[PDB]
Symmetry: D2
Subunit: 247 residues, 4 copies
Amino acid sequence: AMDISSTEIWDAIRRNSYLLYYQPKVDAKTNKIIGFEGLVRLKTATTILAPIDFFDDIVLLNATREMQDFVAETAIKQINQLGGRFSISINIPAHYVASSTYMTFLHDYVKEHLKYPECLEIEIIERTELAIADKNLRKIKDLGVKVSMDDFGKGYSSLAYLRSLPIDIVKTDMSFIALLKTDRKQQIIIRAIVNLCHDLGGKVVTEGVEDMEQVEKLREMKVDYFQGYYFSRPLPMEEIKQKYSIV
Amino acid sequence: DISSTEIWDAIRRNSYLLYYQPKVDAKTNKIIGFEGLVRLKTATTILAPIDFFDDIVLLNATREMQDFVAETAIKQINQLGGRFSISINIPAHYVASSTYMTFLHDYVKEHLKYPECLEIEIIERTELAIADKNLRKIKDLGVKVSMDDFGKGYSSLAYLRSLPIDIVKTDMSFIALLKTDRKQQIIIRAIVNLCHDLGGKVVTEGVEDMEQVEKLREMKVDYFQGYYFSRPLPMEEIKQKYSIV
Amino acid sequence: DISSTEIWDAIRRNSYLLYYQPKVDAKTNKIIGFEGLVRLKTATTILAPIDFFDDIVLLNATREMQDFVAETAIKQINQLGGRFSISINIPAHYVASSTYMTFLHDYVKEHLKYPECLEIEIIERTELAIADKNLRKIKDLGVKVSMDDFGKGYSSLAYLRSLPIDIVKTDMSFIALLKTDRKQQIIIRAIVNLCHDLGGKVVTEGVEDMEQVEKLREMKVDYFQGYYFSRPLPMEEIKQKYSIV
Amino acid sequence: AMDISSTEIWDAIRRNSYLLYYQPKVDAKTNKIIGFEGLVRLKTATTILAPIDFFDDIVLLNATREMQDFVAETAIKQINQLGGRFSISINIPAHYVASSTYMTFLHDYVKEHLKYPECLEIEIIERTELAIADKNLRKIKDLGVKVSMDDFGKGYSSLAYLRSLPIDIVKTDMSFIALLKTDRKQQIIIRAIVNLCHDLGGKVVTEGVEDMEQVEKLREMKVDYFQGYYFSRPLPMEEIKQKYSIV
């Protein structure tokens, strides 16, 4: 089911034709932009694709390394440009986090290139033995880098990730904060999870924020940061800065 | 680029379309049928399920979506008068549901003039004896059964063994990079020969160029689908492109 | 050490047992019920499902196994006169089946004298609105619902959200290594508090020593299960050990 | 559901208390033992456990590396002892095969220690991008080592493994060869898969062989090797040699 040919896709992947888009994260209290989530895009001849569409091809073309490298290097340059005023996250699959060979290169590339290590966040995606991953992370954390995890509680074994990795930020996906006017159990669950994160000394980002009634509830349940359409879809850095002259 | 609100409103309004991807006979080069593929028509855009499937999940709307696809495909099969087949994708969990299949079975019995022209494409492929019972009850009406993405994921040979599969579909990557992949060519022919020995036929999806066609034709693949013929289209546009339709 | 032939013959002969693992009240230290656990009695040995589950799969015998467990547990609940609860493990795919649950529901209605003493333990944990409907219909009889291995695998918080869960069970590793795991202790209390705020209770499985008991008791865990009390036993042996039973 | 306590298990894993058992593989034609499958066991205080029971604990105790190392070293010593007359396989999870860091150590340990590299078989279990795995394998294959894969067609994406890894031997599990008197489709499937393996220039091992009627069918469909109860359950090397004075 494709509006465009697989061929046009595969040639874009060979051109290493990626774009990094950014979605603002806002402080729940001050409503100020505190950083961005980096979200890779593939620019083809006729359009721009999101990872959910072109994933299959990248694996089959064994291009996953190129893409990660792109994401990390582009993000590091972007953080450097913003004078340390904003954090930027990159999505790194659990497989990659658990690879010492990758995580050693990343540590090295970060140490050499990133002027503001405290403004990078590794966001663990596509979530086994956790000790190697734990060590990989701890080494990059030694530089000042933050660590988050996506899909909390939807994804695999979120509690074990939380227990055995050095997580700073828990991110929740859109379903987690939907239906709340008519969902007392989910209101209780959210509050339990937020207070747990805080008692672990971390913070929570709720993605998929769509409306002000959600903002009201989440602010009252002590969610630290928001992300979602209500603030901004993901955009080129260019269009962020045109929208938010702050940045 | 669009809100989840926008997607929600569409699904809540059952705002679906069924597009069609033509299937072409490797021997005659004539269109012989279509893969039916569902889409969400939101206020500003059109989405494929993957861009909203989990939102379908949130809203408990897979059944409503499943009725839309069966109802729509049957109406179009009828309208085409037995000249073309149309497949509908049914998740394996629905295929296993005695409840849903009896419902579907009685629906086809009641409304489908040309049951040999319906194909149930089993997608999202676990337990099997009940699924096999369900599937045979409808095939007794004349309906055909296929399975997609053969080779990919869990238990392809197991489904093939256990279910009354008429047609095996492969994905775009099964036929990718063949100019240097001797091993895959060996594999493809072996599978085509296997399907043929089991009384069935093969549809390779993802056909992108003539070079592929030459090889697959030589390997005795029975049908092609892919951007090289046509990407998925609404039937009105299908009809513009193909006067035979 | 045994043949697949031996396993086959057992399953074909429906040669099953139901063992019981006691559940102990953290407050009173009294046995309050049992987790029912199925076993295959082969001509020479006794196996846990994992050592034959896929052989169960081959032979299409999960339903036959599912009837044995429900029938047996109900007979024992009746025989114990409402003094103890007994849980049965039901796969999530059966819990989702409107067909199977109505069957079970009418079965309990007909045969179980003490429905508040049955517990359906949802195991092997996807779609949920139908599962929630199925589960509520039987809970209307008085039956309780639990879920095992909370924390482990997919969507624990999702099942908790969406299903009428009375009891959350954790596995042995949720409570493992706590002498140096400050983070897990924080997590455990948070979950116990969560369950309590949702009107439910918690069973920690895998309890192996007194040190664990001291901590879990302080964390307000409601029930314990584990080798520290008793491994799984047939009821005749349960009765030898526990005169209160 | 344990007949023994988790504690007794976890202490055995800490003692690195493993045994390697062996299940004969027999040539379909000559009915001669040609090699063994190595199958790890955990010896505890009161019993001896198979991997299906104690897996959970090994991961939670992050002992997977110890166990693999045990399996490889024990197997290498055993092959050396048998004068090159028999092959022995070791099960290595797909994760480990795709780890260059592990596969480099294994290559090094093999080159240093194994006198008969042609008598070792890496059997890929617990079956993503395949190019790294492909390379890892190719390097060990450069020493003479063979490569097989388990669970053919039951496991994940068996066809892609077959396509993109340098596989020598395809192994099928017990279900694949069950019900054959009353299964024409499966008879056709088996034959298709065997001839495919041969056309790829490999060989097939059918495990789960239980009776002579199976032997008759599989021999006639050109299966190269047999394994299963009909010949021998897995045993200590000691009990193999007492049973088969050949070895």
